[PDB]
Amino acid sequence: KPPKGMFLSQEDVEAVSANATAATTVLRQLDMELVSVKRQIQNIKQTNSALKEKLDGGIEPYRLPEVIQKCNARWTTEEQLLAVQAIRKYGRDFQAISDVIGNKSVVQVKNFFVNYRRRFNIDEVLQEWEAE
């Protein structure tokens, strides 16, 4: 039942009691420890000031507009060939492959992967992607 706004553990009492100068010793240990953490702050926030500098401008110069292309069900030869090459560069990342083609949902990409599988040797194409 210690008083509110007083801190008194058995350990801390014994540690200030143990010696005739333990009190003054324990207090400087923390004073030095406090200085060491305050200099580590100055360092890492001067480091972080420098990185915030090298990021000046963001990525707005390198940002490309968004394509509003309406997903279509009819597969053109262009789209079939984009796909085979997308399967070659990416793996089974159906999302990326849809993004590349620009008018095929993730479902149709998943469909395509078995419909044309025989004719576009998709098994062979995946083996080539796994090797690299």
Partner: protein, 661 residues
């Protein structure tokens, strides 16, 4: 109730029999519940009657008269109860008109050393019981450590000043019997720092609360953690306060550390993120040029050249997503970091100025115990807490001397008679004293019994002011050695006009250093005339006794000027400065529970001495040497009520021995 309130006013439990009662009424307390409630009612009622009119003797007859049945049934029981009460001084104590005049035929002879309150209280009781009493007093006056200054209308106590509540206080009875002008003390006490500036109300409240919390902590440290020995030495209250303060300073530092340690943990999350965002901005720039080049190959193009434009576009919107998700995560870590910088923990536990004000609250505690906190027993300094009286603390405007001077009436008192040697044997005692004025004039008093009320200061004196023959036993001398005898001085400042707030009784002055926290730390105005009393407490008391009255009145006026301004503070008409440690009939102010002592030593001080037999193989003698005084009453030490009660106790113990029970 009325009957129950009389038990309370007599420091007795209304619904239970005491140890003292069990001893004198074993038949009753060992027997059935019904008879005990009869006992307890007769007792409580007899007390009520005495207390309701303490200016005239309450006789056995008068008691039985006013008792209703079935409590007046048993007349021997009523007579035993009345006799017990009268003997132990619970009724017919102090100054009352006697109904049946005291018989001329006196039994037994007692010498009482000292005519302070303990001495005078005992002397009256013994004379009331028809013993021959003579008091030997070294001073040219009665009262002892009750000392009142008087020049013209100026009146100021250099000793006891305060009645510490009337609720259970036997000075309540004495105040009716003797005209004392009892005036309540207004608890309002403004502080004033070294310069003269009242402490700001918010700060004052803050330090006072820290003081109480610091004290409460030493108690917890004592009772719960059992921190009562350190290096095979008893722990001081001072030591415990140092250790509690140091642990509060440690927690302030420990707090800052944990706070800054979670700022660097955030700044190192941010560093790791910024590094990831810088490397991603480079890969976005590198990959943008690649797309720009690929798209600058104008159509018509084969499908591989089209795929290159599309794949790089997809790859670049991906990396532009990641960087936007990371720039979000950056924003919330920068908000979090601005919040930790906004809410820092406390810079320091107590400022230089706070520690100076806290040192005044320690001076107040050193005043109360009349000793440096380094001397006080942590475990036992407050051992008398449960017995404190209820009600407002009062002062005696009359001057407290009015009380002993009253008690002294009708008593054989030899003033200017310094006891030198106390001889006690199986057949009686010799007390050898001298005239204080001419030390060569020697006196021999022969008695059946000696009551010693010599202050603990005197009993402690080495080499001894008083020789005991034979010498006091180790068990008594060890108690005298162990027990604390403190010091506390008063400076009386008599003026021609009031230059202070006349509705403020107390006001503090904060000292600059710890080393001088006690020095003129408090001022009382309590008197009709314009008088201020400055206390010199703590380590200051001993040191300030080697400094002249002029210099002390000097330091006093300075401190008052600082608060009231040079134009408002005149020269004082009359000044007195107490020097209680140097006073050879006191050797200090009053007892305190020293580190290494307990309430148990107060009981050892009260145990009477039984001499050895004259002829060997002769039966165990009766006890000859008895002890009273504030240092002998465990439950009311260092008070006038304590001295009073100690006298009444010994008078009963002596009468029981030499007149029979």
């Amino acid at each position: 109730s009325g009957v129950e309130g009389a038990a309370f006013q007599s420091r007795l439990p209304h619904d239970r029999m005491t140890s003292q009662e069990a001893a004198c009424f074993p038949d009753i307390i060992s027997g059935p519940q019904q008879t005990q409630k009869v006992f307890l009612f007769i007792r409580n009622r007899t007390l009520q009657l005495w207390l309701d009119n303490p200016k005239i003797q309450l006789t056995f007859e008068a008691t039985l008269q006013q008792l209703e049945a079935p409590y007046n049934s048993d007349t021997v029981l009523v007579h035993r109860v009345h006799s017990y009460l009268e003997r132990h001084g619970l009724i017919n104590f102090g100054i009352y008109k006697r109904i049946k005049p005291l018989p001329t035929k006196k039994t037994g002879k007692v010498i009482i050393i000292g005519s302070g309150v303990s001495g005078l209280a005992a002397a009256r009781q013994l004379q009331s019981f028809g013993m021959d009493v003579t008091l030997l007093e070294a001073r040219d006056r009665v009262g002892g450590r009750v000392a009142t200054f008087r020049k013209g209308n100026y009146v100021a106590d250099l000793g006891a000043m305060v009645v510490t509540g009337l609720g259970g206080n036997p000075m309540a009875v004495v105040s009716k019997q003797v005209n004392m002008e009892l005036a309540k003390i207004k608890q309002k006490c403004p502080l004033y720092e070294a310069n003269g500036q009242a402490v700001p109300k918010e700060k004052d409240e803050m330090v006072e609360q820290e003081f109480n919390r610091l004290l409460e902590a030493t108690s917890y440290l004592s009772h719960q953690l059992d921190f009562n020995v350190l290096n095979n030495k008893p722990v001081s209250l001072g030591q415990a306060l140092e250790v509690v303060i140091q642990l509060q300073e440690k927690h302030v530092k420990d707090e800052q550390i944990e706070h800054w340690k979670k700022i660097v943990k955030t700044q190192e999350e941010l560093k790791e993120l910024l590094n990831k965002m810088v490397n991603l901005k480079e890969k976005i720039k590198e990959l943008h040029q690649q797309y720009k080049e690929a798209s600058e190959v104008k159509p018509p193009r084969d499908i591989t050249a089209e795929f290159l434009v599309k794949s790089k576009h997809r790859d670049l919107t991906a990396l532009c997503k990641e960087y936007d998700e990371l720039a979000e995560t950056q924003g919330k870590l920068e908000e979090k970091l601005q919040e930790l910088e906004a809410n820092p923990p406390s810079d320091v536990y107590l400022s230089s100025r706070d520690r100076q004000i806290l040192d005044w609250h320690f001076a107040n505690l050193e005043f109360a115990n009349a000793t440096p906190l380094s001397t006080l027993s942590l475990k036992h300094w407050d051992q008398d807490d449960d017995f404190e009286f209820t009600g407002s603390h009062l002062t005696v405007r009359n001057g407290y001397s009015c009380v002993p001077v009253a008690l002294a009436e009708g008593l054989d008192i030899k003033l200017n008679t310094a006891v030198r040697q106390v001889r006690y044997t199986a057949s009686g005692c010799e007390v050898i004293a001298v005239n204080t004025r001419s030390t060569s004039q020697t006196f021999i008093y022969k008695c059946d019994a000696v009551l010693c009320t010599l202050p603990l200061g005197v009993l402690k004196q080495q080499p001894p002011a008083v020789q005991f023959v034979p010498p006091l036993p180790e068990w008594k001398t060890s108690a005298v050695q162990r027990m604390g005898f403190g010091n506390l001085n008063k400076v009386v400042l008599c003026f021609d006009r009031v230059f202070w707030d006349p509705s403020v009784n107390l006001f503090g002055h904060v000292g600059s250093t710890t080393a001088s926290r006690g020095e003129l730390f408090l001022f009382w105005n309590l008197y009709k005339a314009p008088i201020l009393l400055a206390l010199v407490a703590g380590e200051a008391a001993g040191i300030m006794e080697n400094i002249s009255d002029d210099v002390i009145v000097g330091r006093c006026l300075a401190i008052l000027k600082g608060i009231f301004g040079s134009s408002a503070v005149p020269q004082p008409k009359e000044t007195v400065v107490s020097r209680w440690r140097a006073d050879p009939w006191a050797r200090g102010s009053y007892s305190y529970v020293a580190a290494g002592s307990s309430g148990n030593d107060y009981d050892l001080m009260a145990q009477p001495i039984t001499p050895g037999p004259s002829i060997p193989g002769a039966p165990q003698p009766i006890p000859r040497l008895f002890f009273a005084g504030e240092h002998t009453i465990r439950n009311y030490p260092a008070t006038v009520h304590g001295a009073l009660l100690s006298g009444l106790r010994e008078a009963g113990r002596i009468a029981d021995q030499f007149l029979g029970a």
